[PDB]
Design a protein around this nucleic acid. Structure first.
Lengths: 94, 272, 94, 96, 256, 94, 279, 262
DNA sequence: AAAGTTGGTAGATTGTGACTGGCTTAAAAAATCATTAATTAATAATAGGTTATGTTTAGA
DNA sequence: GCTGGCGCGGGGAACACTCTAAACATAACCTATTATTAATTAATGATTTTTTAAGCCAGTCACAATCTACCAACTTT
DNA sequence: ATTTACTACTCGTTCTGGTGTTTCTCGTGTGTTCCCCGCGCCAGC
DNA sequence: AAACACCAGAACGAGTAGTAAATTGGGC
């Protein structure tokens, strides 16, 4: 049971309710929970299935170098960028 | 898209909900208060949800509750179970035919009852004895446990009472006991139905629709459940119910009962 | 208790001070005190007493062994006065 | 006037000792002589002189302000007998 | 028996279950005379009403529109042990199981089964005869038939909706009787085995033929129209109310 | 080494840069990391230190019933609310 | 409105990050990398044990200030990732440990004690007595070259001798690139550990004259336990991107072996050799 | 020697350190002729520039205005081992430690130290002279003085000013030490703290110009004392060339140990 | 490949030399002392004018 | 197979103290009051105590030198 | 009666581009002991 | 020249009015 973080943006309300089924809606569009890895991939299936032209990034706890991993769906001014195996986030211009 | 529930061990134990209407917003289980403070509830991370007086639940909310497999239990005063609803088709027929098949034979039933006794008190039951006198022995042993643990905690104990009317407004001992045993009944039926077994097929008790829940809860109630309720009765707070629910839920957190309940039930059914 | 006998008792009490150090010190302390009175300057140790110098009127003295006269010129003599604590602790009688 | 500090100063100057040690030596130096004389013992310092204890009999005295006769009680006093080495160095001194 | 409540809130004020409309239309309900209360979509029951309903043992079943689907139900897994153990006693004995299955064929096609036929043999009879009925009725109502194939195509989707509606009302009927949805006879192992069997008892009477007719009319949204039509048949024909004696005789085939 | 998630809102840019010193800024006001409990409380000291009339929530992984824990700073329409020992979030009306 | 910027322990950090081709600036108190196209890259400088700066970068003054305040060593690197320059705050060093290292470095007998402890920590065997320090350098060097030949035959890479300078690399060398880049990664996290505890990275024991003697020694203790073999795996597989795979593999080695968390007790055990209880 | 670079980008174009200004004014700096470059705020150094700095061994030290602070330094923890072992040897030997501390007293107040005197005793003498200088300067500039009692929480106006002055002093002192290449933690009169040698050499020239300016600016009593104090300290350090002249000072201070520095 | 021969450099262990350390003695200087006739500290209670010296306190 | 449950060990906050000169607190000396009492000085040769110059023999403390000897390096079979 | 989709439509919030504006977030006798967090060995589905 | 404080201004997307619509999300 590892920690899970879901950030929703420009997504239809179905996705935010569906994510509110398992995770906690603590802020506008930012979801946090602690579930198993299988359930993490199922909820990621929800993210891929119910979202629209919006963009969502999901970050979960692991035991890698940073102790966490994340995955993105859609397009954002903040795009994940890999630095020699290390996945960081870069801020695109206008 | 479909709606898959999660494994039962990766879930919060129970949540008590009061004084608000339950609606669905955009596919979410929300508690709506009269003042307008709406409460998002991660319903898919919960094993069982308890409904206190003051709750008004709509049809679609019950539908969403059933589709995520979280058992909802209407509870009233003293936390006693009143009503509950779950999905019907969450059971494998082979398990039900196995349980009822074990219920068909009297001797296999005595085997499983002796299994419950040996798992309950460690010692095997006296051999070649009928069910009713085992019920009397059960009552004597449980009463002795009441006197022993109450004498340990130094709590006012004058016997067990079930109706809250006869309580002298300061009883609080049967309040904590009944609240704890009722919460255990809740998570117990939650696990039994989560695996897909029949809680109506009883072994020690007969006639009542949750006699199986009563037996399974009687197996492991005296390990952690009674003493903490005796602590809440000893310290005597103004609102004991909240402390009993918090305490029992954290006991289920620390002892990790849910994940081990399924092999426990399989082990009990092994004697058949 | 003479000079040397004074030295050891001090070194006895002053274990952490070398015995050779105490020996020179007592020699130097008293020699320094002598030179002070030798130059006409007084010594005053509060709690112990004071050293003063007294003049004596010159007069034709005598050789007391023989009775013969002797011409004695004026000179200065040392004089000690006991201090308060010295007076109190020394006198055991009322 | 010669003081404990100047004696400690001379210990510091000549022997290079710590001012803490130079103080305590001079401090205890007279302390032992205090202890010795109060112990009824005569202290005879060659090159310096003698510390003698003399007991004086009760004798008539008075209040020098008025003349009111009050007797001088018996007592043990400490007296000094300068040696010839000391006497020689002082006879030719110059009082400032 | 039962009651249908729609688009109204259930509260209790004076010892009666009232159905509260948005305009205030109240439905005062005597608590008995019904074994089960069907909660159709649009209803919001209060906690105290659930408490009183629990006090009288009347089964609450959260259903679809007019009971088209079964979403949730109280008393899950049964309520009285004697009836469940009776069904199980008939289920585990292959002789009694074959007796009741032969009753299912007896009421299924009206014709009695040939003697000394097993559950596997009667299953072959039902499979070939019922498949022949699929091709037969598809040929009669002018339906292109490719062998009853679905992939999780309009006609198979219409038939699928028909089976969904029938599984709904039949499952509600079984829960009203109080028996287990999984303890089945022709189908076994599945959680809707008894549901699938008793649903197979009356499947080809009106629901599947109406699905064939509406499928021949071929609308844009077939599943909704077929579901509403099956709703209308369930309302008019009182199918859910009539399924009770059918299961009474089916499980009566065990000779009490 | 537990998971760490910081959500910022109405905060001055100093707090956002300071949080970006240790944590990864994957979305607008969304910070994620994995550090120990101490360092977590130190960064929380930064949050209490620099946020002026803003609202910030920090959520960290534990081994409690939720598997994670969180606390808030400032005022939001979404505030944490306790449900019989369980910390959840309530959506306040206008 | 100034809370003190404290550095976090080094064992709880990310190993290293490599930065290239983009200007280094600070925005609102964050270490952000901005590329010429304008894509800004937030970099958690406080979560890194050491940051490696490849060509193409332009570092600002305030960026050096912020990097120094969080105890993250910046390392200017060059061709094949070789270390060239570095700068972090020197004053992360409370004087007792520095005086202990210098005390052990001045005394020839304690020098031999600590060198013996080094030989005992590398090769698992008691150091040979009645041998001068120079003899210990000769024997240690022969044993190390024997380790290069042995691992080279084991994994199978064509060995032609260790050559530091990338000038002699024949376009398919791949072996000296893996070795040198791996050693640069280890020198990075090791130097970060040395300054993190606060010892003198220039005051060395085995090596003399070179400004990184102590770093070279401490890395020489444990490079052949985990790092050099993985570098030889990367050299054997021979990919089109040797540097990236060397960085990822060495990085996972540092995560796996818990290298940074054990570097400080390693140095404590090395300097305990002088019979004096470490401070 | 040393050089300050301010408000411009440091690149390499023609094999020399060029300073890229906002107007395009390039400041040619040959690779030699400088042993250390102090980079004032406002500069952005390029990678090729840092590589050239390493290639000719020129130390880079990121500082404040005119060396008011030292933020970071290359060759962190020292660069020459022989000089660090030289200083450490001077620090471990009690006789040599007393020799060099006596030299610090000799250059601190101009007067030779009293002989046969230990280090802690010299701490007492130097401290008494510090109090005499506090009262005397307070008498000179006519400022209310109550002693140097501050809080390390609230950050009085005179202790604020003197604190900032000593901060600038630590700035140029540490910059000079790192320019010479010695360890800030290997100290003589002060020990234990990582800036012990900084504290000592800072105290050598503390009361010559800087603290008097602290008392003067405290007399003028501005609303924001710290900024005016450290800007004036910048003026002192630029005009008097204190940072440029501290290096031979430390050369003589450590020379008084007589082990012939490397 | 395996033994056998070098061997140089830590660590130990001895050799030597220079310097502390009491013990005893020598004498060497320094103190007693015997005996003048008379001078002169020694005192008591009191006030007031130095100061030696303990006590604190800002400085490192 | 990497995790949860009790364990010490290490690196920091009180605190625990050192040294100076100068300023201050104050109780302790100084003088100057009387007349009667008590005790020292003048001197030298003879005798007497204390200290010390010179061993000078013992030891002992640190350092030069000489010796064991290991464990690898390098010839021999 | 409830819930969902769609559509304006407000508006708190985040980002960007302008101006100033400022080049910093600071104090130093030393060593010596309690305090809790942190790697590190045993029981486990 | 970098970088911070502070400002208006533009996106901009979250949240909330209305309205319209559905009662659903398989097949065994």
């Amino acid at each position: 049971m590892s920690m899970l973080v879901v950030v929703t943006e420009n997504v239809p309300p179905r996705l935010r309710g569906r994510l509110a089924i398992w995770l906690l809606e603590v802020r506008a569009g930012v979801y946090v929970g602690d579930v198993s890895a299988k359930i993490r991939e199922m909820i990621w299936e929800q993210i891929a299935g119910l979202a629209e032209e919006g963009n969502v990034v999901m970050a979960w706890a692991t035991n890698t170098e940073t102790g966490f991993e994340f995955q993105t769906f859609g397009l954002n001014r903040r795009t994940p960028v890999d630095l020699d195996g290390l996945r960081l986030v870069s801020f695109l211009p206008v | 898209l479909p709606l898959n529930p999660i494994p039962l061990k990766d879930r919060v134990s129970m949540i008590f909900l009061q004084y608000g209407q339950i609606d669905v917003i955009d596919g979410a289980f929300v508690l709506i208060d009269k003042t307008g403070i709406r409460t998002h509830i991660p319903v898919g991370s919960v094993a069982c949800i308890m409904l206190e007086p003051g709750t008004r639940v709509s049809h679609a909310a019950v539908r969403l509750a059933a589709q995520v497999g979280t058992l909802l239990v209407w509870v009233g005063e003293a936390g006693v179970r009143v009503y509950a609803s779950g999905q019907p088709g969450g059971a494998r027929s082979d398990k039900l035919l196995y349980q009822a098949k074990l219920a068909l034979d009297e001797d296999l039933r005595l085997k499983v009852v002796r299994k419950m006794f040996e798992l309950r008190f460690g010692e095997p039951a006296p051999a070649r004895r009928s069910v009713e006198q085992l019920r009397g022995i059960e009552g004597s042993r449980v009463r002795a446990t009441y006197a022993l643990l109450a004498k340990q905690y130094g709590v006012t104990w004058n016997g067990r009472r079930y109706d809250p009317k006869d309580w002298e407004k300061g009883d609080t001992i049967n309040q904590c006991i009944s609240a704890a045993t009722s919460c255990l009944y809740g998570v117990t039926e939650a696990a039994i139905l989560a695996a897909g077994y029949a809680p109506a097929i009883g072994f020690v008790h007969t006639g009542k629709p949750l006699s199986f829940v009563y037996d399974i809860a009687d197996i492991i109630k005296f390990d952690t459940v009674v003493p903490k309720a005796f602590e809440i009765a000893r310290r005597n707070p103004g609102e004991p119910d909240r402390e009993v629910r918090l305490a029992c839920r954290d006991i289920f957190r620390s002892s990790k009962t849910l994940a081990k309940l399924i092999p426990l039930i399989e082990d009990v059914l092994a004697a058949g | 208790m003479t000079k040397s006998e004074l030295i050891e008792r001090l070194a006895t009490q002053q274990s952490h001070i070398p015995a050779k150090t105490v020996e020179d010190a007592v020699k130097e302390m008293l020699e320094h005190m002598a030179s002070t009175l030798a130059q006409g300057e007084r010594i005053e140790i509060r709690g112990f007493g004071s050293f003063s110098l007294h003049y004596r009127a010159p007069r034709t003295g005598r050789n007391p062994k023989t009775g013969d006269k002797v011409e004695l010129e004026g000179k200065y003599v040392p004089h000690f006065k006991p201090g308060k604590e010295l007076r109190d602790r020394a006198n055991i009688y009322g | 006037a010669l003081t404990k500090a100047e004696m400690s100063e001379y210990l510091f100057d000549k022997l290079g000792l710590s001012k803490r040690d130079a103080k305590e030596l001079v401090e205890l130096f007279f302390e032992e002589i205090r202890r010795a004389l109060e112990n009824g013992e005569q202290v005879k310092l060659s090159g310096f002189g003698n510390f003698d204890l003399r007991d004086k009999n009760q004798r008539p005295g008075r209040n020098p302000k008025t003349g009111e006769d009050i007797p001088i009680t018996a007592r043990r006093v400490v007296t000094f007998r300068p040696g010839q080495k000391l006497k020689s160095r002082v006879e030719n001194a110059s009082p400032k």
